[PDB]
Structures are given as structure tokens and as C-alpha cells.
């Protein structure tokens, strides 16, 4: 059984598309889309956005178990993400695109959800990212490292208000995000503050990207 998608590369499949991996165990699979092309491939994608059709302003339960279609936009699920990061060391890459036919990205050497936590729920599925290699976009996620995942259901942020509610999304929020890759798909520039799919360091808080996907590969 392949538990990640770098295993699938070893299984003998190299065309990027929908694939089944067994992160829990052989009992139940979960489909994901894998980017076997970018930088040699072997990328497991836990996040896709482009059409804007699927709404990412969902609850904590949908974000734990995951929601969406592996074909188009989806979210793999925080629990599944934890099973991968718990048993293997992983590398992070996020790929972004605006409405001006420009591409950008940012890479982080280490990436983990609630590392060395006896139970991910109790720890709120903390996000940890280490050494950052710069691509097109800046470094927004290093601001988020060490923060529990928050939703309008469950406020874990360090802000007196519910930063998840103000940002129209879910993320590992601090006082408030520099990256809200689950914000509302406002499709271009917007006069509201920091509530769309925003990467602060690349296009600021008043610009909503067109495409977004967060990729993961073995060590």
C-alpha cells in the first residue's frame, strides 16, 4: 500500500492526476491529486484552488476530515495531513498565481502538523515550518509557525476577536494572518482587509489570487 505519493512514484506511476494513498492504513484510502511534474515531482497536494467554486469558509469538522473533490479544488483534511507528517519528514512548496499571468512560490525545508504530539486534537494541529527557500513569493508562513489551526467554530488564535471569522477562512492564525490561503475567493483586488486568498508578502492584503495549491514531498 502507498501511504504517500512519493511511494506512488516508486509504485510506477508518474502522470500527475488523482491517486489513492493509505495514510491511516490499508482499511480506508483517501484520494489526492499529485504533481509529479513540478521540480521532479513526487508532490502530495493537500490544498487546491482555481475555479473558486468550492467555498473554503467551512467548519472545523470539514477541515479535520477534509472536503472537496481531488479533481478540482479540495482540502485533504488535517487528520490525514497529521498521519503523513507524523511518520515521515516532509518538504513544503506552495504555488500561487495572480490574474496577470504571473506565477510565484515559496519552499520550506521542514513541515509538520502537531509534531511529537500524543494527540493532534489536543494540540489543535499546530503548524511547524523551518528553513525557508525563497521563490517568487515572500515568506508569510514563518509568521504562522507554532499556531493552532482555527475556524469560526474553534477560535485558537492569539487575537481577542475571532480572526478566522474576520478573514473569511481557516488558517493557523496568530494576531492575524500574513497568509490566508483559505480566504474567500474575491477574484482580484478587493477593498476589504485581509479576507481573501492573500499572500501578504507577494501581493499584499488587498489582492485575491487566482490559483493556489500547497504541495508536500518526502524529506
Amino acid at each position, epitope marked *: 500500500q502507498p501511504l504517500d505519493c*512519493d511511494d506512488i512514484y516508486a509504485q510506477g506511476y508518474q502522470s500527475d492526476g488523482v491517486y489513492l494513498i493509505y495514510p491511516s492504513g490499508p482499511s480506508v484510502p483517501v484520494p489526492v491529486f499529485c504533481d509529479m511534474t513540478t521540480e*521532479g515531482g513526487k508532490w502530495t497536494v493537500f490544498q487546491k484552488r482555481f475555479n473558486g467554486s468550492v467555498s473554503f469558509f467551512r467548519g472545523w469538522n470539514d477541515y479535520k476530515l477534509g472536503f472537496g473533490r481531488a479533481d478540482g479544488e479540495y482540502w485533504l483534511g488535517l487528520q490525514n495531513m497529521h498521519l503523513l507528517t507524523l511518520k515521515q519528514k516532509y518538504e513544503l512548496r506552495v504555488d500561487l498565481e495572480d490574474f496577470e499571468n504571473n506565477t510565484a512560490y515559496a519552499k520550506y525545508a521542514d513541515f509538520s502538523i502537531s509534531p511529537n504530539a500524543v494527540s493532534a486534537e489536543e494540540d489543535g494541529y499546530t503548524l511547524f515550518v523551518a528553513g525557508f527557500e525563497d521563490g517568487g513569493a515572500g515568506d508569510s508562513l514563518s509568521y504562522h509557525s507554532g499556531q493552532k489551526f482555527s475556524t469560526f467554530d474553534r477560535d485558537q488564535d492569539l487575537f481577542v476577536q475571532n480572526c478566522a471569522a474576520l478573514s473569511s477562512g481557516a488558517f493557523w492564525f496568530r494576531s492575524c494572518h500574513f497568509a490566508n490561503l483559505n480566504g474567500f475567493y474575491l477574484g482580484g483586488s478587493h477593498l476589504s482587509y485581509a479576507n481573501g486568498i492573500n499572500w501578504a508578502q507577494w501581493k499584499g492584503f488587498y489582492y485575491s489570487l487566482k490559483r493556489t495549491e500547497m504541495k508536500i*514531498r518526502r524529506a
Partner: antibody
Amino acid sequence: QMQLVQSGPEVKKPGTSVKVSCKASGFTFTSYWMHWVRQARGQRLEWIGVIHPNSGNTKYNEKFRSRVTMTTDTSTSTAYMELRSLRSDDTAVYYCAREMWNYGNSWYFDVWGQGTTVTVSS
Amino acid sequence: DIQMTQSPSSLSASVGDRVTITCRASKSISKYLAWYQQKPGKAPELLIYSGSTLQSGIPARFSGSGSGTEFTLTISSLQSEDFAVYYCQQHNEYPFTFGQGTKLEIKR
């Protein structure tokens, strides 16, 4: 030891087909990807395509599609490559090579056969 | 698509010398490149991979560097085993091109 044993050389007329074998030993054949590369004498090496024995998936070079077809016999741990319609310029040495795995780009060949000199002429 | 052109076409140097070979890319190829060593009538042997990382068992004097369009392979001090033909491969994209080949010969 990790070794790839290719077939002996063949001399073919133009337009005919040739079938080159490449048998693996010293490593589990089903785990690693297999590449095919040709080296025309005093010229640049050309990457033919790739095949994985376990799945049978293939990915060819654009210019060789329709002409070359790759197969694998899992029982004998052998990889086959066959060029259907031959052309006088195809005279070259054909290698089979194994792609190592290495937690990233990979796509580089750590273990090679030893060449199958193919001569095509009327 | 993504031609690879090596330089110099032929190089002559003596043992113990510092030698440098360069591989050029037509289009942006990123960090990823690999080098090979082909002895006469032998299969190529892999030396460097992903631009700067060397394969296990290769001597420490072999080293690779470069990024983007230009890459270089350098050897601290040659040895009799080092004289051969060296090839540069594309590695980043899936057309997969190879280098023109560089003759490294002994100088008398």
C-alpha cells in the same frame, strides 16, 4: 552484483524492426524505473523513453512515439525495447539504464548496461 | 527544446592540474543537472547529480556548481583515472537532452 545484461548486436535492413532485451540482476527489478538511451557515435546521447516494470506505464520521447514500444517480462526480470520502422541514421549504441531514487528530483541514471551496437544499412 | 551545449569541445591538461568544464542551457533549467564519465567502449558512469551533489563512491576532488542557465564541473587535481569523455544531462524537464560531450585528454 547490480548488473544489466543487454542483448548482443544486430544488423538490420532499413524499414525492418529490431527488438533489444535487457535483463536485470542484483536488485528487485519491479522497484526501479528503467530508461533507454542511445549514443550515436561522436554525437549527443538521445533519451528514448521510460518504463516501470511493476505498473507497465510508459513515457516516451516525442520524436520516437509510434516507432518504439517498450515491454517488460516480470517473471524473467527482463526489459525489452523495440524500434518498429528503422532508418539509416538509427545506427548507434543503445543502452538500458536504471533511475535511482533519492528523495527529490531523481531522474538520473546510476546503473547502466553495456551497450547494444545496432547497425542499420541496406 | 532545452538544448545542452558543452564547452570546451576538447580540453588537454596534465595530471595534478585544476580543470573546469562548463555546460550551457538554452532555457532556464533550475538547480537540477547531472554529469557523467564515459570511458572508451564503456557505459557512462554517473558523477554529479542535481547540479552540485556527488554520487557515493566518487572521489572528493570531483565537485559541481552552477544554477540557472550555466553550470560547471571542476576537478581539484586530475589523476590517470580521470581522463575520459564527460557528458552533461538536462535532468529538470522531461524532454531530456544530453550534452555535446567533452574530450579530456592528457597533455604531452
